[PDB]
Design a binder for this molecule. Structure first.
Ligand SMILES: O[C@H]1CCCC[C@@H]1N1CCC(c2ccccc2)CC1
Length: 384
C-alpha cells in the first residue's frame, strides 16, 4: 500500500492547497466587498480601513513567532475562526464602531490566515518548480477574490443587503475551516531581529511594499478620480477592476512557466514587474475613456502578479538557503510589507489627492518605483 500512500499523500496535499486558496479567496472577497459598503453607516473611515491594516502591522510581527512555534494548520484554524467572527460581526451589526472592530479583527485575521496559508503552501510544496506553481495558484485565487468579488459584492449588496450575503459567506468560511480540519486534522526560528537586518529579506520586503503601494493608494482614490475627470456613475466605476483579473492570472502563468524554463534571472522577472508598474505610474493619469483606465489597471494587476508570483517563491527559497527553514516569520515580513502599504493607503491617499492632486500621486508612484526598480539588483547571485 505504498503507492496508495503516495497518491493519498498527494490528494491530502492538493486538498490543502485548494482549501487554503479558497480561504484566501474568502478573505480577499471579504476585504474588497466591504470596502464599498461602509460609508452607508455614518476622515474616520479611511482610518477604519487603515486600522485594519495597521492592526495587521501590530499583530503579524508578533504573530510571526506565534506562527513558527506551531504547525501552520492551527494558525490557519485561528485565522478562519476570526474570519467567521468578523463576518458575522458585519452581517448582524450595523453601528460604525462594531463595523470598525470587525474590520480590525479582519486585520488580525488576514495576518494569521493569509500568512499561515501562504506559509503552508510554501511548506507543503518544498520542491521549487511546483512551489512556484502552487504560489501562483494562491495568487490566482487571491486576485479572484480581490478583483472579481467586488462585482459579485455590488450585485449582492445593492440587490440583497448585507445580512444574507455575509452570513452565506460566513457559512462558506466556517465550512472551509471545518473542511481544513477534516483534511489536515492537527525547531527554533529566525528572529525578526535577524530578518530585518538581512539585506535580501529587506530588498524583497521593500519590493512587496512598493508593489502593493499602488493598489494601496488607488482603491479609495479611483472613485473620486472617475467623478472628477471621467464623470462616472454606479455601473461604471464599480466594475473597472473586474477586467484586470484575466491578465493577472495570465501574467502569473508567465512567471510560473518561466520559473521552470529559465530560473536563472528570476529577480529580472521580479523587477520587470515593478518596471511595468512604473508604466502604470505613467499611464494611469492620461486615460480618456473606460478602456484606457481598464487596460492601465490590467497592466497594474499584471505587474503585481509578476512581482508576487516571482517574489513569494524566492522569499521561501531565501529563508531556506540563508536562514532556518520555517515559513511563518518570513511571510510575516511579506505581510508586514502588504500591511504597511494598505495602512499608509486610506489615511493619506484621499487627502493628498484633494490637496496635491492625482498626477502628483501617480508621479509619486513613479518616483518610488523608479528609485526602487534597480534595487532588485541586490539579489544578483542568490539564485545559485
Ligand atoms: O504581497 C502579496 C503577498 C502577501 C499576501 C498577498 C499580497 N498580494 C497582494 C495584492 C494581491 C492582489 C491585489 C489586487 C489584484 C490582484 C492581486 C495579490 C497578493
Amino acid at each position: 500500500a505504498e503507492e496508495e500512500k503516495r497518491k493519498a499523500e498527494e490528494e491530502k496535499r492538493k486538498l490543502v492547497l485548494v482549501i487554503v486558496c479558497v480561504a484566501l479567496l474568502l478573505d480577499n472577497m471579504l476585504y474588497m466587498v466591504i470596502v464599498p459598503i461602509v460609508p452607508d453607516y455614518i476622515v474616520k473611515i479611511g482610518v477604519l480601513f487603515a486600522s485594519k491594516a495597521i492592526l495587521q502591522l501590530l499583530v503579524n510581527p508578533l504573530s510571526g513567532p506565534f506562527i513558527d512555534r506551531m504547525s501552520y494548520d492551527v494558525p490557519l484554524l485561528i485565522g478562519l475562526g476570526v474570519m467567521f467572527a468578523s463576518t458575522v460581526l458585519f452581517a448582524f451589526a450595523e453601528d460604525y464602531a462594531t463595523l470598525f472592530a470587525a474590520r480590525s479583527l479582519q486585520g488580525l485575521g488576514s495576518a494569521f490566515a493569509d500568512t499561515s496559508g501562504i506559509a503552508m503552501i510554501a511548506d507543503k510544496y518544498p520542491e521549487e518548480p511546483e512551489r512556484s506553481r502552487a504560489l501562483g495558484v494562491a495568487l490566482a485565487f487571491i486576485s479572484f477574490g480581490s478583483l472579481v468579488a467586488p462585482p459579485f459584492g455590488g450585485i449582492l449588496y445593492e440587490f440583497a443587503g448585507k445580512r444574507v450575503p455575509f452570513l452565506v459567506l460566513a457559512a462558506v468560511s466556517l465550512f472551509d475551516a471545518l473542511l481544513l480540519l477534516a483534511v489536515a486534522k492537527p525547531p527554533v526560528g529566525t528572529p525578526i531581529h535577524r530578518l530585518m537586518l538581512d539585506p535580501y529579506i529587506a530588498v524583497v520586503a521593500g519590493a512587496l511594499t512598493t508593489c502593493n503601494i499602488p493598489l494601496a493608494f488607488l482603491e479609495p482614490t479611483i472613485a473620486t478620480w472617475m467623478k472628477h475627470t471621467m464623470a462616472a456613475s454606479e455601473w461604471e466605476m464599480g466594475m473597472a477592476w473586474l477586467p484586470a483579473f484575466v491578465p493577472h492570472v495570465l501574467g502569473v502563468y508567465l512567471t510560473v512557466r518561466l520559473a521552470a524554463r529559465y530560473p536563472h534571472l528570476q529577480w529580472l522577472y521580479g523587477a520587470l514587474g515593478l518596471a511595468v508598474i512604473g508604466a502604470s505610474s505613467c499611464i494611469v493619469p492620461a486615460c480618456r475613456s473606460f478602456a484606457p483606465l481598464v487596460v492601465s489597471l490590467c497592466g497594474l494587476c499584471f505587474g503585481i502578479a509578476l512581482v508576487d508570483t516571482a517574489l513569494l517563491p524566492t522569499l521561501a527559497f531565501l529563508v531556506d538557503v540563508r536562514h532556518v527553514s520555517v515559513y511563518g516569520s518570513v511571510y510575516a515580513i511579506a505581510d508586514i510589507s502588504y500591511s504597511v502599504a494598505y495602512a499608509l493607503g486610506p489615511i493619506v491617499a484621499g487627502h493628498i489627492v484633494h490637496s496635491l492632486g492625482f498626477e502628483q500621486l501617480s508621479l509619486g508612484m513613479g518616483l518610488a518605483n523608479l528609485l526602487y526598480a534597480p534595487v532588485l539588483l541586490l539579489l544578483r547571485n542568490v539564485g545559485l
